[PDB]
Amino acid sequence: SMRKKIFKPEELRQALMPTLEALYRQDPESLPFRQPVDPQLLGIPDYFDIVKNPMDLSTIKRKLDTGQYQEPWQYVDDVWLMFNNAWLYNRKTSRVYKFCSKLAEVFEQEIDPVMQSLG
Ligand SMILES: CCC(=O)N1CCc2[nH]nc(-c3ccccc3)c2C1
């Protein structure tokens, strides 16, 4: 009975893109997240056993760019999935885990006022 899909996908693309862009701008911290994790290249054959739903910046970019997000929270859910996969798979002491945490912090700071602009 509630209202759904009040925003056009293209309005969400415009509103949210800056938050994606801020993650891309993080150097070196975005580098492990730019492309899908390739278990064969990284020599981690258990990756897809542990991470059942992979997500990365390129995939999010392409969904946002092509209007695949129909609700703002669907984009946020994908960013969080990317982070949560990285924190699940990687050791807490690891370079990639620390980089995840830095991206997560940048994202939090970026997304809160944007989601208020959608209020
Ligand atoms: C968030 C990415 C992830 O979980 N990876 C698994 C462990 C890992 N180690 N090194 C990387 C990596 C570093 C730079 C560029 C691409 C991947 C990755 C990617």
Side-chain angles (χ1 to χ4, degrees), residues 2-115 117-119:
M2 58 165 173
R3 282 186 180 93
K4 278 162 164 139
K5 301 178 188 189
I6 71 168
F7 298 105
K8 294 176 197 194
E10 301 83 2
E11 289 170 323
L12 295 181
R13 178 175 69 195
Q14 181 178 76
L16 300 167
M17 197 56 79
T19 73
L20 192 55
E21 284 172 336
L23 301 182
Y24 271 83
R25 171 161 60 249
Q26 302 311 309
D27 172 41
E29 295 93 345
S30 75
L31 298 171
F33 297 86
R34 296 294 199 101
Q35 296 177 44
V37 171
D38 182 338
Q40 186 187 5
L41 176 50
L42 295 169
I44 52 171
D46 74 334
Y47 184 82
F48 288 147
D49 299 323
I50 290 163
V51 185
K52 297 184 172 265
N53 291 294
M55 186 59 50
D56 74 293
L57 286 173
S58 75
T59 300
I60 292 169
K61 178 169 176 52
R62 295 163 193 199
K63 286 174 74 169
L64 194 60
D65 287 349
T66 52
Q68 288 178 58
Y69 294 117
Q70 292 186 297
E71 301 280 19
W73 59 78
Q74 289 178 339
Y75 161 84
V76 171
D77 285 345
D78 271 351
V79 172
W80 292 344
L81 177 60
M82 182 180 59
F83 296 150
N84 287 332
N85 289 345
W87 287 320
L88 178 60
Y89 185 73
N90 294 280
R91 193 178 158 172
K92 293 157 181 67
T93 54
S94 71
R95 185 168 178 280
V96 166
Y97 192 102
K98 324 310 254 307
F99 283 13
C100 189
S101 295
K102 169 66 189 190
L103 293 183
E105 182 173 273
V106 166
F107 187 65
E108 187 226 337
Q109 295 180 359
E110 278 292 311
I111 196 60
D112 280 6
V114 169
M115 293 297 282
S117 87
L118 290 173

